[PDB]
Design an enzyme around this catalytic site. Structure first.
Site, short mmCIF file in Angstrom:
data_model
loop_
_atom_site.label_atom_id
_atom_site.label_comp_id
_atom_site.label_asym_id
_atom_site.label_seq_id
_atom_site.Cartn_x
_atom_site.Cartn_y
_atom_site.Cartn_z
N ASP B 81 0.58 -1.10 -0.07
CA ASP B 81 -0.12 0.12 0.03
C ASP B 81 0.86 0.98 -0.01
O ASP B 81 2.18 1.18 0.23
CB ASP B 81 -0.95 -0.17 1.28
CG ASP B 81 -2.30 0.80 0.95
OD1 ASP B 81 -2.60 1.39 -0.19
OD2 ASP B 81 -2.80 1.14 1.76
N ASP B 254 -7.93 -7.91 0.09
CA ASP B 254 -7.04 -7.84 1.32
C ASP B 254 -7.86 -7.83 2.27
O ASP B 254 -8.76 -6.99 2.34
CB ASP B 254 -5.96 -7.19 1.18
CG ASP B 254 -6.27 -5.53 1.73
OD1 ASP B 254 -6.35 -5.28 2.76
OD2 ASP B 254 -6.70 -4.68 0.66
N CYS B 292 -12.51 -28.82 5.18
CA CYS B 292 -11.37 -28.21 4.85
C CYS B 292 -10.12 -29.15 4.57
O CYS B 292 -9.98 -30.02 5.33
CB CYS B 292 -10.98 -27.21 6.14
SG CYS B 292 -9.66 -26.00 5.64
N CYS B 294 -6.78 -27.93 4.95
CA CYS B 294 -5.69 -27.40 5.30
C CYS B 294 -5.17 -28.58 6.35
O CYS B 294 -5.64 -29.47 6.73
CB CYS B 294 -6.00 -26.07 5.94
SG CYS B 294 -6.38 -25.97 7.90
N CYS B 297 -6.77 -29.01 9.64
CA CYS B 297 -8.10 -30.02 9.52
C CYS B 297 -7.61 -31.27 9.05
O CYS B 297 -7.53 -32.28 9.54
CB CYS B 297 -9.11 -29.18 8.63
SG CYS B 297 -9.55 -27.68 9.46
N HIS B 322 -5.24 -21.96 9.70
CA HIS B 322 -6.48 -22.28 9.18
C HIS B 322 -7.32 -21.38 8.43
O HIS B 322 -7.73 -21.53 7.47
CB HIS B 322 -7.53 -23.01 10.20
CG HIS B 322 -8.80 -23.10 10.00
ND1 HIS B 322 -9.28 -24.08 9.31
CD2 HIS B 322 -9.79 -22.25 9.88
CE1 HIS B 322 -10.57 -23.86 8.85
NE2 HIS B 322 -10.78 -22.67 9.37
N1 LIG Z 1 -4.37 3.30 0.16
C1 LIG Z 1 -5.69 2.85 0.61
N2 LIG Z 1 -5.66 1.84 1.35
C2 LIG Z 1 -6.82 1.41 1.86
C3 LIG Z 1 -6.88 0.40 2.87
C4 LIG Z 1 -5.71 -0.23 3.16
C5 LIG Z 1 -5.17 -1.43 1.97
C6 LIG Z 1 -3.95 -2.28 2.40
C7 LIG Z 1 -3.11 -2.73 1.14
C8 LIG Z 1 -1.92 -3.64 1.55
C9 LIG Z 1 -1.49 -3.53 2.79
C10 LIG Z 1 -2.02 -3.01 3.69
C11 LIG Z 1 -3.18 -2.36 3.45
C12 LIG Z 1 -7.87 -0.01 3.38
N3 LIG Z 1 -8.25 -1.02 4.34
C13 LIG Z 1 -9.65 -0.94 4.45
N4 LIG Z 1 -10.24 -0.02 3.72
C14 LIG Z 1 -9.10 0.65 3.00
C15 LIG Z 1 -9.05 1.74 2.16
C16 LIG Z 1 -8.10 2.11 1.76
C17 LIG Z 1 -7.95 3.33 0.44
O1 LIG Z 1 -8.81 3.84 0.29
N5 LIG Z 1 -6.70 3.53 0.28
ZN LIG Z 2 -8.54 -26.03 7.96
#
Ligand SMILES: Nc1nc2c(CCc3ccccc3)c3nc[nH]c3cc2c(=O)[nH]1
Ligand SMILES: [Zn+2]
Ligand SMILES: Nc1nc2c(CCc3ccccc3)c3nc[nH]c3cc2c(=O)[nH]1
Ligand SMILES: [Zn+2]
EC number: 2.4.2.29
Lengths: 356, 356
Positions: B81, B254, B292, B294, B297, B322
């Site tokens: 990020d 993520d 599962c 994994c 499990c 898990h």
């Molecule tokens: N740059 C950015 N990151 C967000 C994250 C973290 C994602 C992230 C990616 C990779 C590693 C860590 C965090 C958000 N998490 C929840 N809601 C989110 C919104 C945004 C957003 O609008 N902009």
């Molecule tokens: Zn499992």
């Protein structure tokens, strides 16, 4: 495989290397026996924590779940302690009573109940119910304590023999006491040998006495035990304690250090212990130990440092895995060097590097 | 393999399944991208935590150690990020300034510095430096925030393109903002497409709005993005959030939940989340999830329950393993069902069981 057979394959001085054959597996000695809950299922036998298990979830419940082997997913031998050391509260000739800090429930421990709990847990090596004498102890108190432990040893023997499934499939170790006093250690050894056990533990050490005193007690205590049976030093120890105890005839070891240190940032290496959290490891690209074959030694000291400093559980897990693996590599090198007749040289080389 | 190639292999409604080819590996979509420090090195790409890394040990130090791939022992793609979301303190058109709670050191973050940090970390998918608009937001503030993020998106594009090794070997994603407002989301999508990015993230969600509102925003927001490029929903989410987001055209995910829940006793199963610490699991011999695959499990709910209640690190590690594995199995079933044209049925069956 037999219920229990100990065979010595090679000797060097007082040190021995060999095997214990049991129904569930072969244990190579000298052996280190790790806490079974320390990592995923190398070690030939693991420990169950009787005292913890009788409180949570309870021995009967473990038995309802199929016993410790099924519960922990480990089909090889398991050793359990007798539970009184860990407890020790109100003591008497019958046993010890105590209140569980977990739920206030009252629990009695006696030789008979200790053997029954270990039967319910399904362990393969059962420890007699003893009194670990506090250190330091006067000769009079050490003698009283040792004498009670020998009466309890006979009661443990009888209770074990009265459970056919246990008598026929498990093994029972007696525990020598006597504090640091040679005459009490002799009396205890004679009492245990007259009862007869499958192996003999040296109890009442690793209680704060320090390595010099521990080695002095081993010097006269281990020869009192039957030579043709395994010798188990309870609670020992640091890597250098283990090397010196093998030099004095010990075959089996357990110790909280690998897992405790693994949770407090300390890693064991052939160059001694290191605290991985120290800033000096922040850019150290060498693996935890240079010669270590464990899976962690893929990962650098720098990365493990980072994980632990960042509070990631992965960091503590890798540290623990490394420490357990280091202890087993230590035991393998001990066994190989005794077998090859080069253990004296290994011990000298180990100590020069470990303490440099 | 090319620097970046996204190909869609099958579609069902708005859902897509396909592959992103990068120099370090192929990413199967829809993809879940786990925290890289969560477990030992299934996932096709992991996350680096830019904000944490720029504080400890610092981006320059990570680069001195060979970059994140060498540092973490992971040779496949890594996404980072841009760091501002995590930071957000003093903000301006230049960027954000903040003081590290770790050591009081001052740090600036700007589009240029964010791209430079991610270059030093060596990540394969670089996020533009955006402002995550707080929720709820008025239309005026959401618009101001989105407009600043689009100016920062162009500055991120230029900084990325000015580093030849980054431009030629990594990929850059732009991040759509606009809060919950359809016209601002459209303006943001148009601004990002006019700049041109390798993939497009939907930002500014998973900030407390709730699933209904999140799905409503996805309903109009995802179609605004280029169809032939990957769509990444940042921060999402629970398993049912992921299923519904795939149904709305998202390709990449993520979420902190698998690892956070794994540390607080919560396991994800096809029958919904369970809290393994609850007494109802003390005698439950079924594995964490019945279907599962994994490694956990081997282990029953009863044993994992015991480990966590006993404070053993092994318990939290197995729970985390898990959960990460469950998320990847979820993504595999999504990908297979879309490819086989049975995703609509899978989603219905998943929700009936998960919420029963
Ligand atoms: N740059 C950015 N990151 C967000 C994250 C973290 C994602 C992230 C990616 C990779 C590693 C860590 C965090 C958000 N998490 C929840 N809601 C989110 C919104 C945004 C957003 O609008 N902009
Ligand atoms: Zn499992
Ligand atoms: N029964 C007993 N246990 C001891 C332990 C615990 C060993 C144990 C075995 C298996 C599981 C847990 C604990 C000691 N630990 C350090 N010094 C110790 C001495 C004794 C002792 O004299 N008697
Ligand atoms: Zn190692």
């Amino acid at each position: 495989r037999p219920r229990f057979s100990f065979s010595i394959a090679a000797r060097e001085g007082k040190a021995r290397t060999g095997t214990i054959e049991m129904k569930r597996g072969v244990i190579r000695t000298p052996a280190f026996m790790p806490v079974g809950t320390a990592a995923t299922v190398g070690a030939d036998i693991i420990l169950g924590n009787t005292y913890h298990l009788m409180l949570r979830p309870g021995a009967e419940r473990i038995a309802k779940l199929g016993g410790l082997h099924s519960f922990m997913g480990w089909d090889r031998p398991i050793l359990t302690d007798s539970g009184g050391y860990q407890v020790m509260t109100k003591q008497s000739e019958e046993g010890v009573t105590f209140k569980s800090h977990l739920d206030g429930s009252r629990h009695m421990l006696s030789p008979e109940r200790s053997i029954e709990i270990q039967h319910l847990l399904g362990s393969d090596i059962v420890m007699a119910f003893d009194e670990c004498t506090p250190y330091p102890a006067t000769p009079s108190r050490a003698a009283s304590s040792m004498e009670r432990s020998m009466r309890w040893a006979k009661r443990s023997r009888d209770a074990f023999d009265s459970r056919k499934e246990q008598a026929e499939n498990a093994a029972l170790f007696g525990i020598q006491q006597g504090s640091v006093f040679e005459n009490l250690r002799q009396q205890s050894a004679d009492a245990l040998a007259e009862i007869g056990f499958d192996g003999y533990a040296v109890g009442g050490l690793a209680v704060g006495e320090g390595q010099d005193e521990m080695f002095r007690v081993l010097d006269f205590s281990v020869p009192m035990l039957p030579d043709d049976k395994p010798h188990y030093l309870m609670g020992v120890g640091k890597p250098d304690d283990i090397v010196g105890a093998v030099e004095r005839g010990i075959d089996m070891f357990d110790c909280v250090l690998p897992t405790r240190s693994g949770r407090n940032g300390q890693a064991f290496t052939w160059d001694g212990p290191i605290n991985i959290r120290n800033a000096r490891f922040s850019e150290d690209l060498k693996p935890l130990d240079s010669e270590c074959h464990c899976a962690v030694c893929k990962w650098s000291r720098a990365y493990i440092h980072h994980l632990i400093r960042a509070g990631e559980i992965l960091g503590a897990m890798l540290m623990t895995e490394h420490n357990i693996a280091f202890y087993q590599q230590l035991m393998q090198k001990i066994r190989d060097s005794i077998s090859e007749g080069r253990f004296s040289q290994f011990a000298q080389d180990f100590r020069a590097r470990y303490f440099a």
